[PDB]
Design a protein around this ligand. Sequence first.
Ligand SMILES: *Cc1cc(-c2c[nH]c3ncnc(N4CCOCC4)c23)ccc1O
Length: 250
Amino acid sequence: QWALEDFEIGRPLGKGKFGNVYLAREKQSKFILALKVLFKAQLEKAGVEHQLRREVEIQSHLRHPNILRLYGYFHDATRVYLILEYAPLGTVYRELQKLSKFDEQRTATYITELANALSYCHSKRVIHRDIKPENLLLGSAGELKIADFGCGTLDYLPPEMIEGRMHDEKVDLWSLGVLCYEFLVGKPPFEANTYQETYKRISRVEFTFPDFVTEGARDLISRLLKHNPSQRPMLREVLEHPWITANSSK
Ligand SMILES: *Cc1cc(-c2c[nH]c3ncnc(N4CCOCC4)c23)ccc1O
């Protein structure tokens, strides 16, 4: 239903590990999009065949402004290619790098658009992890936009998932707190230079605020960063927490 002969590829958008991401244009409409290459070399040794071809079917029928649209996919002999929305202002990762820290307005706005994008996913009975700043792209209007749903680096994982317990959708409200902290402070709250330390930090939820973090964020962050899932606010509440409303954008 789609082949590489339909696209002229262009500039590399990003690269590394299992394949590459190229900007490209669909010939018969001149549509600008993004192609993800996989090589399938990692399909073996990860056995992640059907993997995504399953996640592909899931995401491909999701639709929302703060979620990066996936269009289709196709089999090369060697490579596997994904066809995604192209996001003109790149990752939040790069911008966090460029700016070091975010102000409360940009932080609380991103947090809003994220909170909305998740409740929609919950409503389609979709839960997950990631939401690492490398997986948040920016639309032409600066709107946040969630990349994919798929050891690892640990620091966005919640205590219940790393203790090996069971996890529901409340995983995503951990994540929200983690990012809102990273967005305000420049680094994630349980960062370490060791997988083993970070692991400790996360399971004991040990974080401290630098002084410049205001009380309204300390509050929101705190409420999201609790070892006990059932004690994390509901998305509905997050969207309406004063500091959000006070600082968020229209
Ligand atoms: C698989 C994947 C695809 C992208 C992606 C989608 N649209 C983009 N527009 C600009 N840049 C990027 N990336 C890709 C990776 O490095 C540069 C940022 C876009 C994003 C993340 C991802 O996992």
